[PDB]
Amino acid sequence: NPTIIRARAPLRLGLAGGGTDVAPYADTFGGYVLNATIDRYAYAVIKTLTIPAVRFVSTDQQVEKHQLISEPLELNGTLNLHKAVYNHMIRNYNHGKPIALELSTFCDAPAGSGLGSSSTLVVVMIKAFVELLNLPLDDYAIAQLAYRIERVDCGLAGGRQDQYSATFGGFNFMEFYAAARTIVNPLRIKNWVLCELEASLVLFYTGVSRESAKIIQDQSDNVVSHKTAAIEAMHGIKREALVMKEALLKGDFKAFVASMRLGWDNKKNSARTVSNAHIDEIYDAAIRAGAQAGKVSGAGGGGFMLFFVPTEKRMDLIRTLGEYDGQVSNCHFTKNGTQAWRIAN
Amino acid sequence: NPTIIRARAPLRLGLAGGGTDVAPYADTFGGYVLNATIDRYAYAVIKTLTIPAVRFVSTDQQVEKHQLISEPLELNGTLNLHKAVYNHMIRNYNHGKPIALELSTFCDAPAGSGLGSSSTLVVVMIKAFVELLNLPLDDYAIAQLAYRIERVDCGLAGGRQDQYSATFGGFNFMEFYAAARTIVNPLRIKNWVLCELEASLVLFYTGVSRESAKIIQDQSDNVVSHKTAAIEAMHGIKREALVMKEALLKGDFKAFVASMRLGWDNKKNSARTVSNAHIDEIYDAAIRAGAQAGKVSGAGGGGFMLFFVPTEKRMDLIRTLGEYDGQVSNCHFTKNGTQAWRIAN
Ligand SMILES: [Cl-]
Ligand SMILES: [Cl-]
Ligand SMILES: [Cl-]
Ligand SMILES: [Cl-]
Ligand SMILES: [Cl-]
Ligand SMILES: [Cl-]
Ligand SMILES: [Cl-]
Ligand SMILES: [Cl-]
Ligand SMILES: [Cl-]
Ligand SMILES: [Cl-]
């Protein structure tokens, strides 16, 4: 009888520091990122098959089907991450002997939403295989493996923060250093601070961003080509991540919003397409309505925005965002990282 | 220096049984309701004032301001629930001596959303006063007090389930009997069942319902005027609440969806405006896309719908709902009931 396994991993809001985790900056100066997992998930499912075949199904419902062969699967550009995860697991834990299965993914947010879905989907595929094969991989190992698969095996350029949020869960302050060295600091935030933060945050989905790869490229170029003003903006991103971390540990909401404002200026000045006329218009309207600070969650150029608003202006801000193109939602944080369960066998 | 208190209480999805908690049915036959709190909240805030005044602010930003007087506040039709909570608390715990404060509310969903916000807002106002005055009210007492304030003091007709979800939190099966007797059964659902359910539910907000008071009136009339077929539909609502409860405890998803389907037919047959052409169109399209069952969350006539969809059809259902008028979201349950925190003093 077939085995059915599912895994999920929470998506994440980038609170501060994003951009300092791009390869040249982190390797040169050290990066800081403060992020927190929310109540939206990426999912993977493994179904063992009774036919000699392997099948891959994606979130946007692309589908590939291959015969069971004893060579690694080619990374031909269709579903490369699915195939690279499968390839690593067969080679390293099944002695190169293929397994007949279907590996499928789905997600509560599309790519370019700014919630780290791309890397979270790699994590959850890994977790589904950890459960299938009973592997002793710890959280650092899962996060590092996800990074290797996406950035090396599949050669996709990007950041370092999303693998860690997806694996560990909760509020984390991450330190990124040269030679793939990362330190995760789980933040033990007081219950009243978490409730006050949730009561003060409004999310707004502005549509899919098509700028992430560009922004990351520009930020990497700032360091390589010595663009002094742009590197200094990045230095500001880094400083304010620490300021925001300490404000949360101290329950200091005045310092939290001051740091988000400074951080948002810095982020916009680090790469040309982080914001635009359309985002700035939403941002200006939110401030007019009573929001104190805000930012694009991910790399920039669209996707989710978050706003900090005092509770007496919250409904006014919700009403105002109603006039603009996008979807309003509340913000609820999750403490758990990636997890798996079984349905058959 | 002023004291600032906030409280929140989670909103709820009606899974089964709704309608059997209307006064004539529950009092005559006994009602059953299965519900579960989600990641959306109603909030109340108390701010002590340094001027001799009392101020009330609502979710839709109505505002009333009164001089500090030693008579109960009149329930003139503007912000009656706010005033009735304040009145009860001053009379019963402050010896009839007024307190200078501002009592404000806000909510993650508007009235008529089908998530129990009206009664949840009464609960959260009560909780804010429990925290202000350090009252020893237990959960049964908070739920009963909320019911009395809304239904008796303020004479607003309605159900019995929302007070209990808002106060207790989590998944509960409630038994409603004559003489205001209610038994709350917290369901201790297995972790894999909760994850599988979340992975299988899609929410869809269709807009504000204006039918709730009408549906509840019609359901109450079915019993009083002996409308045999309509009472029998209500008997079916009740039966299937129990079937669904037991399916969750057993992790039996086949029985869960079969019961939701039967329950939805029953609910539509119990009152004429529970569904309509527009809801049926969304429902039919969801089924076409691969959903197995679904229902309006609250009394009916609009508000939130929920769909059960096998994971392999989830993205297809999300895409399809995209074609219709309303907002798609995931479903994440919360285990905690109402809670409070302090900001100043
Ligand atoms: Cl960031
Ligand atoms: Cl995918
Ligand atoms: Cl994303
Ligand atoms: Cl992202
Ligand atoms: Cl970010
Ligand atoms: Cl119901
Ligand atoms: Cl209100
Ligand atoms: Cl509601
Ligand atoms: Cl409701
Ligand atoms: Cl209901």
Residue numbers in the entry:
A (entry chain B), B (entry chain B): 2 to 346
Publication excerpt:
To improve our understanding of WcbL, we solved the crystal structure of the enzyme to 1.78 Å resolution. The structure was solved using the single-wavelength anomalous dispersion (SAD) method, using selenomethionine-labeled protein to provide a strong anomalous signal. The solved structure reveals that WcbL adopts, as expected, the GHMP sugar kinase fold. Native crystals formed in a number of related space groups in identical conditions, and determining the correct space group was challenging for many crystals. Native WcbL and an AMP-PNP complex had a lower proportion of the monoclinic fraction: for these complexes data did not process well and the model did not refine in the monoclinic space group. Comparison of the sequence with galactokinases reveals a Q-L mutation at position 162. This facilitates the accommodation of the extra carbon unit in the heptose sugar compared with the hexose substrate of the related enzymes. The native state shows a structure with strong stability: most of the structural elements are built from hydrogen bonds of 4.1 kcal/mol or greater.
Here, we present the structure of WcbL from Burkholderia pseudomallei. A critical step in the synthesis of heptoses is their 1-O phosphorylation, mediated by kinases such as HldE or WcbL. We report that WcbL operates through a sequential ordered Bi-Bi mechanism, loading the heptose first and then ATP. The protein forms a head-to-tail dimer, with the two active sites facing away from the dimer interface, in line with the native molecular weight predicted from size-exclusion chromatography.
